[PDB]
Amino acid sequence: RKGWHEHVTQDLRSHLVHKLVQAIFPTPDPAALKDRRMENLVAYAKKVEGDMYESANSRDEYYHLLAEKIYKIQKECE
Numbered sequence: 279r280k281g282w283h284e285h286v287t288q289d290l291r292s293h294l295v296h297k298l299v300q301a302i303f304p305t306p307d308p309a310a311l312k313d314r315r316m317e318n319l320v321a322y323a324k325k326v327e328g329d330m331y332e333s334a335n336s337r338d339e340y341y342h343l344l345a346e347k348i349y350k351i352q353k354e355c356e
């Protein structure tokens with residue numbers, strides 16, 4: 279349990295999970311991507327966010343390094 283974890287809400291953690299999904303699929307039309315397909319992307323994004331949440335030593339490092347991963351993915355996918 280790290281000190282900075284006490285100041286990060288689950289709503290921020292979910293928000294960054296969904297930013298990772300958006301980096302791969304910026305137009306999440308459910309006619310293009312079905313229910314199980316969406317759940318798979320969210321499952322992978324949760325592992326990526328989860329690893330940063332456990333390893334970061336500050337709220338700034340957590341947010342800015344996840345933002346850097348999101349932009350890296352967005353570049354690779356665009």
Ligand SMILES: *SCCC(=O)N1CCC(O)(c2ccc(Cl)c(C(F)(F)F)c2)CC1
Pocket residue numbers: 298299302318319320322323324326351354355356
């Ligand atoms: S999208 C074209 C690029 C590619 O083959 N990549 C970059 C993105 C991935 O690292 C990836 C794919 C799906 C998800 Cl849900 C994630 C992540 F959000 F990080 F979990 C990453 C796959 C390899």
